[PDB]
């Protein structure tokens, strides 16, 4: 619970804030490379099924 | 008094330092409380339980 709560939070001014990503995999690449913060507020293209 | 004793030994006053993961070398995101505790071994041995 603590880990999931920590990863799904937002900070006001984090590294990589305000960029546009092609998908979740690009977000993971940015996080692992150290180019973006885990709490940065961005816009992501999401595909969802109903 | 504890903070003064920490200052005498040239240690951070908060009692928290930066650590690195041994498997990847990456720094943990937040400072961690590291110090010394007195541990005991109790007379409940798994050799006598199994």
């Amino acid at each position: 619970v603590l880990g999931l709560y920590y990863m799904t939070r937002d900070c006001v001014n984090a590294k990589g804030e305000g960029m546009v990503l092609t998908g979740p995999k690009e977000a993971e690449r940015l996080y692992r490379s150290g180019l973006a913060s885990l709490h940065a507020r961005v816009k992501v293209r999401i595909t969802e099924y109903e | 008094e504890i903070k003064e004793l920490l200052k005498l030994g040239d240690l951070p006053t908060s009692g928290q330092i930066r650590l690195y993961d041994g498997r990847t070398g990456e720094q943990f995101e937040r400072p961690v409380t590291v110090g010394y505790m007195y541990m005991l071994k109790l007379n409940h041995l798994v050799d006598d339980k199994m």
């Binding site: - | 010394y36 007195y38 005991l40 007379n43």
Partner: protein, 100 residues
């Protein structure tokens, strides 16, 4: 030793009776892993006696809980001692302090 204590370690270590405590002052005449011989001071000797104290240490003895009881000396050959000093440490004792 705990390295963070309260000040009661010495009292518990000495009053328990697991250590060797000097009955009279003197000089360490003989030291060994199993026995200690103390040459008593001349002002603490009784008339007509050879003033020496002999301490035989408990070595690797079974306890009531199938554990080990073993004493080790903490004095060197030729050093002065006084009455009440600790001569040998018992189990869970470090220079006269409780060490659990």
């Amino acid at each position: 030793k705990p390295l963070v204590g309260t000040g009661m370690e010495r009292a518990v270590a000495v009053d328990s009776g697991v250590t060797a405590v000097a009955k009279r002052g003197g000089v360490v005449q003989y030291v060994d892993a199993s026995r200690i011989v103390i040459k008593v001071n001349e002002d603490e000797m009784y008339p007509g006696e050879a003033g020496i104290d002999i301490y035989n240490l408990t070595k690797y003895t079974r306890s009531n809980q199938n554990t080990c009881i073993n004493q080790m000396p903490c004095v060197s050959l030729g050093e002065p001692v006084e009455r009440g000093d600790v001569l040998a440490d018992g189990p869970s004792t470090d220079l006269g302090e409780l060490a659990l």
